[PDB]
Structure formats: structure tokens, C-alpha cells
Paper text:
Our study reports on a new class of ferritin-like proteins (EncFtn), which are associated with bacterial encapsulin nanocompartments (Enc). By studying the EncFtn from [name] we demonstrate that iron binding results in assembly of EncFtn decamers, which display a unique annular architecture. Biochemical assays show that EncFtn is active as a ferroxidase enzyme. While EncFtn does not store iron itself, its association with the encapsulin nanocage suggests that mineralization occurs within the cavity of the encapsulin shell (McHugh et al., 2014).
The crystal structure of a truncated hexahistidine-tagged variant of the EncFtn protein (EncFtnsH) shows that it forms a decameric structure with an annular ‘ring-doughnut’ topology, which is distinct from the four-helical bundles of the 24meric ferritins and dodecahedral DPS proteins. Despite a radically different quaternary structure to the classical ferritins, the four-helical bundle scaffold and FOC of EncFtnsH are strikingly similar to ferritin. A structural alignment of the FOC of EncFtn with the classical ferritin PmFtn shows that the central ring of EncFtn corresponds to the external surface of ferritin, while the outer circumference of EncFtn is congruent with the inner mineralization surface of ferritin. This overlay highlights the fact that the ferroxidase center of EncFtn faces in the opposite direction relative to the classical ferritins and is essentially inside out regarding iron storage space (boxed region). The constellation of charged residues on the outer circumference of EncFtn (His57, Glu61 and Glu64) could function in the same way as the residues lining the mineralization surface within the classical ferritin nanocage, and given their proximity to the FOC these sites may be the exit portal and mineralization site. The five metal-binding sites on the interior of the ring (Glu31/34-sites) may select for the Fe2+ ion and direct it towards their cognate FOCs. We propose that the oxidation of Fe2+ to Fe3+ occurs within the FOC according to the model postulated by in which the FOC acts as a substrate site through which iron passes and is released on to weakly coordinating sites at the outer circumference of the protein (His57, Glu61 and Glu64), where it is able to form ferrihydrite minerals which can be safely deposited within the lumen of the encapsulin nanocompartment.
Residue numbers in the entry:
A (entry chain H), B (entry chain G), C (entry chain F), E (entry chain D), G (entry chain B), H (entry chain A), ...: 7 to 97
D (entry chain E), F (entry chain C): 7 to 96
């Protein structure tokens, strides 16, 4: 699932790939579940969709913390913007 | 680009969809660029790919902070795991 | 996200569609996470990937149980095969 | 059809992959068929579509049972929720 | 799932479409299952795969007979070639 | 275009794959052409579309006979339903 | 199957779209069948594949003639290059 | 980009594949551009789109002539139908 | 082809969408033709592929110029980097 | 991610491939972000989307300048059309 041949990729690059596509898949699941929660017309299904939705956010956060500990630029930019106040574009 | 009809989705659900697919696309770009950075055999191109790569991480971080500010469970789970030490699964 | 126009689909068909597509996506996440667990060369990442993997199995089982309660034929066939011993093809 | 090279995957991982994608494909067929059953305006076709639909559930159930027998946490989590009463999120 | 808008398609064209895509999907399942049957290294799984495989052929055959009964050229061409002997291109 | 590596597939399996994918593509063309025939507002084009459509059916029927001759379960199930009368789900 | 909404498209444009996509699908079948013909290890199947292959070329040629009759620039460029000798880039 | 492994394909088959997929891509560009021409509400863009469209037809015709010179059935079938008069299905 | 409903998109956004997607498709064609030029083993075909390739670049440049003239930020950023000589990341 | 096998492609072809798909992805991001800016009903999100949008144009422009410096026909055709006056077609 990589775009370049594995023999020219550094191991750390490939591990970061694994982490990044995981976050991508978690975000997609968050998004789809939230849409299904709004549209669902069954209360028992809605409670299940909403529970799964919010656990995906936890999955994403864990993997994003791993990216942060293993990439100086993820560390730098996440530190600049996360948990701030005032206009996000002026930080 | 939504899986459910727009008329049954809450406004904040659609705006979070816009933000979430944006973060997904930034992540994809990070990964793609980093792979091309490893495989490139032209250092002038490599310099452009790496420059672009790291700005995508900033675009992702900005959008993630917006999500964090506009979604309680994103705020909760990001607070739990980001900028921690020790085992990520037990934070 | 349906193959037929929503206005000819019964309400229950559309809810089962939401549940079915959720189980599909969970199964896919299990499989992909398990492959990344095998291939990962970073122990902290591996711990995270395996943690998320097993929670997707729980998201799936919760949704399958909803399908079972809301579809007589799922109930019948799941009852026949799940939690049995001996040859599966002979139950 | 795997995302990681086969030489780094354990045999058991690959067999579970085969089962898992089988279940996915059965689920998809159940959903597709059910929608076509609702939309179809020919009763003879509808009968075929519905027949096929419910046999895919059986295909899915059989494959899922194998998965369950060959993966400890599938077995654990399915045991928690399947054939229960009261709120599923509990 | 139609290539043309439903509002210009005749009802019977749309029903034949439902049948054709059904057969297409069955054929795909037969093929994927057979490939998994050859590659599987667990005999209990292999037996299930083979079982499912052969029932997809029956799903296809039922739907093909519906097409034969509802389309005169399907009827003509299936009668010319199916269950014949000697060279297929010379029937 | 196979989901499993070629080195573990039997030769006959790969040939059936060639046949099956051919039939799938013929069916897709039949369907696509029939929709275009319905939507077309040019009679000369429609005539071409309809002609091509019905020849795809012949392409499919030929390849389907090859499968019937080379796969016992295709022979069995095709024989149960094809050229029959009364309700198909029986 | 169009990229723009049908009500902004001229009728004739939509009919040329039907013809063009038909030719595209015929070309694809020609290519795939030809590849299957080279790879097949069953002579009887190969004869069916080659027979079908060459009839796709006729389906394509027929539809292409309609295009030529209904589009002045198709007529111009097909006239310039088809059935010529010497270097194609110098026709 | 081939469906069969390159080692079982004849060189000529692969060159024909390169030409066929080129024509397919040209036809797709012709169609897409023609749709954007009808839909555009900017005349300067429209003139560019129309210009590109008609040059794609030329690219297709050139490549189609190469196929004709390198494939007996293309030569046969193109000769039968192109630049004819009266009903196309009857040449 | 758009990701948001057309009725919420400004007319100029939609026209820029048409141009942007045209450039993307032109770039794609340049890349694929260039790959086919390298791999082709028939010199007559290679000459056609190379000719078409280089015309796609002209199609892209024309459309890129339309974007330059109709979008302030494209104009600003293209002006900064196009037709320069020093190291690209420092302009 | 190439359509031809890497061992038949020149090094320069593959690096141009890396730049071109990068430009394509940048163009796609510009378009998607621009559509989201129009549709967004959250002004704080809109400002992030617009910021990111315009930085993608800069990423594209850098990469495009690299292509211009490494491909004689890109340089020739870009020089013909960019930053010109009068009708784009007649330049
Ligand atoms: Ca997913
Ligand atoms: Ca992208
Ligand atoms: Ca390992
Ligand atoms: Ca059975
Ligand atoms: Ca399927
Ligand atoms: Ca049965
Ligand atoms: Ca096709
Ligand atoms: Ca009509
Ligand atoms: Ca294209
Ligand atoms: Ca200068
Ligand atoms: Ca250079
Ligand atoms: Fe998850
Ligand atoms: Fe970005
Ligand atoms: Fe999940
Ligand atoms: Fe099935
Ligand atoms: Fe089936
Ligand atoms: Fe055909
Ligand atoms: Fe055909
Ligand atoms: Fe072209
Ligand atoms: Fe072009
Ligand atoms: Fe970018």
C-alpha cells in the first residue's frame, strides 16, 4: 500500500506510514459514524453508533501521540496549535 | 461527499465532515511526500517535497485544533494522550 | 450511500444498511490493523495497533448483535453456527 | 489483496484475512440484495433476490464461526454481546 | 447504481439491471472464493470457502434463468451454446 | 488481477478466472448498452448500441458454456435452472 | 455517468458521450481479451477469447463511424490519419 | 498496468496495450472537455476547453491509425465502416 | 464531479474547478505518455506518444494561464517561482 | 505508482513522475478546499480552509517550477502562455 517500492523506504518512514494511514482510517470512521448517528431512526442502533464513534477518536489520538513522539515536525506543529486560544490562523 | 442526505445531518456534523476529510487529505499528503522524499534521486526536487511535506503537518494541526475546539470527545481524548510520557495505551 | 433510491427503501432496510456497512468497516479495520501489527518494527506502535484492533472486534460484535435482534434470518443463521463444535459445514 | 507484503505476515494472519474479506463480501451482498428486493418491480425476480439474500447470511455466519474459533478476542467479544437482552451498550 | 438517470429508463430495463449486477456479483464471489480455496492453509476454512463458492454458482444460475425468461436474445444465445458438444465457436 | 499470488493458484483456477472475468465484463456491457439504448435520442446510434448489446450476450453465452464444461458445479447448477418452467426458486 | 449536470448539456453532447464511452469500453475489452488470449493455457477458451476480441473491434468501428458522421472535427482528423502510409506524425 | 504478468505477454500485445489505453484516455478527454464546454460560464475558458478537445481527437486518430497498421482485425473492421454512407449496421 | 452541492458553490468557484480538473488530467496524460515512451518497443508508436505528450503540456500551460488570470493567489505564487534561476525553496 | 515497470523507466522519467503527481495532488487540494470554503457555515473553519488552500497553490507553483527546469517542452510551452496578454489560444 506504499507508493514507492519498500526497498528504497527507510524503516522509520514505513512505520510512520502505518501510523498515518491508521489515523486516516480512524478519522473516516469518526466521520461516517457521526453521519449515521444523525440519520439513524433506531434508538438502539444510534447508541451503538455513537459509542463506536467516540472510541475511534481515542484510537486516533493514541496514534497521533505516537506520530508526535516520533517526528520532530509533527511535534513542533502540534505544540504550536493544540490546546490554544484565539484565532487558529494567528498562532 | 456525505454518506447520508444533507437534510438529515446537523450543521455541525457537516462542518466536522469538512474538517475531518481535510485532515485525512493532509495526512495522505504527508505520507505520500515522505515516501517520495526517500525515493527521489534529485536533491532539488527532494528539497521541495520535504518543504511541502512539513507544511501539510501544519495544515493538519490547525484543523485538528478546530476539531478539538468544536467536539467534546475530541477535546477529551486529545487531552488524555497528547504530550504525555510513558506507555501510550495507558495514559 | 445506497444502491437504490432511498424513497423505495423501507425504513428497516435503511437501518440494516447502516449496521451492515458499519460491521464491514470494522472487519476491514481488524484485518488491516492485524497486518500492520505483523509488519510493524516499532514496539510502541505495535502495542497501539493491537489495542485498537481488538476494540474494533468489540464494535463489530455490538453491531452484529443489533442485526441479530432486528432480522429474523440473521437470528436463525447466527443461532445455527455460532458457539458450536465440530465441522462447521455440517451444522 | 494484502496491504503488507506476504513475507512479513504470519500464515494465521493471512488465513484470517481470507475469512474476514469473505465475511465483508457476504455482508455487502446481503445489503445489496435487500435493497434490490425493496426496489424490484418484478415478483419472480424478487423471490430469487430474497432467496439469495438469506443464503448469504448463512455464508457469513459460517465464516464468522470459523473466525471466532481461530481468534481469541473475536470469541471473547462475540460471547459478550451475541444472544443477549437489554441495552447492547452494557 | 445506473449509468443513465432512472427517469429515462424503462422499468423493465431497471429490473434487468438488478438481475445483471446480481449475476456479476455472484461471478465475482465464485472467482474470489476459488482463489482463496487454492491459497488457504487451514483445511476447516477451505471447506467453508468451497461450500460458499458453489452456492454462489446456484445464485447466478437462478438469476440467469430469470434473464433468459425476460430477454429474447439472452434466450436465443443461451439456447445456441449451453449444453452442447463439439467446438463452442462452431455451435 | 488475481487476489492471491499466482504461484499458489492451480492453472485451471487461473483459466476459470479468465473466463469468469470475461463473462462479468460482457454482462456489464449488456447492461450499459441497454441503458444507453433507452436514453439515446439518436435512432442511428440506438441501432448500433442495440446491435452491439445483443452480440455481447452471445459472447457471454459462449464463455459460460466453457465454464459449464470445465466446472462440475457450474454444470450442476446451470442444469437445475436453465431452460426450465414453473417458479425458479424451486 | 456525465461530469456535468444533464440540464446544462446539449442533447447532441449527451449522445456523443454515449458513443464515446461505448468506444472506450470496446477498446478496454479488446485489450483485456488480447492479454487473456496470450496468457490462457486452455486452447478452447483461447479460441472463444479471440473470437470475442475481434468482434469488439467491429463494435468499436461501427460506433466510431457514427461519431465521424456526427462531429466535424472527428471527421476531419480521422480523414487526415486513417488509411495512410508513411510517418503518422507527418500526415 | 496490464492484467496478466508481462512475462507471458508478447511484446506486440504490450505495445498494442500502450496504444489502446492511449486512445481510451483521449476519448475520455474529448468527452470531458465537451461537457465542460457546454457548462462553462466563462468564454475565455470555453475557447481553451474547445481547442484542447479538438486536439485530443487528433491524438486519438493518430494512435488509432497505428493500431490499424499493427492489427489485422482493426484494419479489416475500420475499413468496413469508416467513411461509408447509409445505415451503419449494414456495411 | 464536485464535492459540495452546486447550489452552494459560487459560479467562479465552479469555473475554476473546470480548469483545475483539466490541468490535472493534462498532467496525468503527460506522465503516462512519458512512461509509455520509455517502455515502448515500437519506434512508430513511440513517436506518436511523444508528440501527444508534448501537446498535453501546451494544453496544461494554456489552462494554467487562465487560472493565473482568474485567481489572485495563483497569480501571486506562480509569479514568485516560475521563470526563476536560484534555488526554488528560497524564492 | 508507475504504469510501466521501474526497470524500463529512466531515472529522470520517474522523478518527473514524482513531481507531476505532486502537482496533481496539490491542484486537487486547491479545488476541494475552495469548494469547502464556499460551503462552510463555520467562519473559524473557513479561515483555516482558505489559509491551507492558498498555501497549496504555493506548493504547486514550486513543484511546477522544478518541472519547468527539468523538461524542455514544459519550459517552452509555459513560456509561451504564462503571463501573456490577449487571447490565450492565439499566443
Ligand atoms: Ca475504513
Ligand atoms: Ca489528495
Ligand atoms: Ca513482525
Ligand atoms: Ca446450505
Ligand atoms: Ca462483491
Ligand atoms: Ca442453496
Ligand atoms: Ca468494461
Ligand atoms: Ca427512450
Ligand atoms: Ca484521463
Ligand atoms: Ca531571470
Ligand atoms: Ca536538474
Ligand atoms: Fe478504530
Ligand atoms: Fe495541505
Ligand atoms: Fe471501530
Ligand atoms: Fe455468498
Ligand atoms: Fe451469492
Ligand atoms: Fe463483448
Ligand atoms: Fe463489445
Ligand atoms: Fe491528448
Ligand atoms: Fe490534452
Ligand atoms: Fe500541499
Amino acid at each position: 500500500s506504499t507508493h514507492e517500492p519498500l526497498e528504497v523506504l527507510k524503516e522509520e518512514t514505513v512505520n510512520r506510514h502505518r501510523a498515518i494511514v491508521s489515523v486516516m482510517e480512524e478519522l473516516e470512521a469518526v466521520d461516517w459514524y457521526d453521519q449515521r448517528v444523525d440519520a439513524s431512526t433506531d434508538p438502539e442502533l444510534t447508541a451503538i453508533l455513537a459509542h463506536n464513534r467516540d472510541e475511534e477518536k481515542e484510537h486516533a489520538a493514541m496514534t497521533l501521540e505516537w506520530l508526535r513522539r516520533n517526528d520532530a515536525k509533527w511535534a513542533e506543529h502540534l505544540r504550536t496549535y493544540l490546546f490554544t486560544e484565539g484565532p487558529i490562523t494567528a498562532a
